[PDB]
Amino acid sequence: SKKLNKKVLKTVKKASKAKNVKRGVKEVVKALRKGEKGLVVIAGDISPADVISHIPVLCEDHSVPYIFIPSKQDLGAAGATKRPTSVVFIVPGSNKKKDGKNKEEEYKESFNEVVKEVQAL
Known part of the structure; x- marks a missing residue:
């Protein structure tokens, strides 16, 4: 579980600067x-x-x-x-970043993972 908070805080922290x-x-x-x-x-x-x-x-x-x-x-x-x-x-939303070479890739992925997990559990 400890790792969870890490990956999570990291994802949100990254997007925090990406508005x-x-x-x-x-x-x-x-x-x-x-x-x-x-x-x-x-x-x-x-x-x-x-x-x-x-x-x-x-x-x-x-x-x-x-x-x-x-x-x-x-x-x-x-x-x-x-x-x-x-x-x-x-709010992980991106129009161009979606298909653009940006952190949105790993970010959205990691995020959707941690988020989805929280929902299911």
Whole structure:
């Protein structure tokens, strides 16, 4: 499992600089509302009744790909090292990068893997 958080934090961290991640309650509701979602990164260290209640609700409602990562360094380095949070929503979307020679390849792959795994489990 330890490796999971690694590969995960790495994927999101890479996309974070590629403008593919969206943190903040606002970005969350918007990602699930506009349909522009990807991976719900939750801070294992910070998770109030809000996330603990929305987790089973949003999951049992639509079953969105939500993952947890107990590591402030990760959640922060992914969302914003300067302004870290506990609720983040990744959005691996690329039009040209999809078929272009970019990190999107390994990124999307590794991401879809970790994400899919979290959903199934």
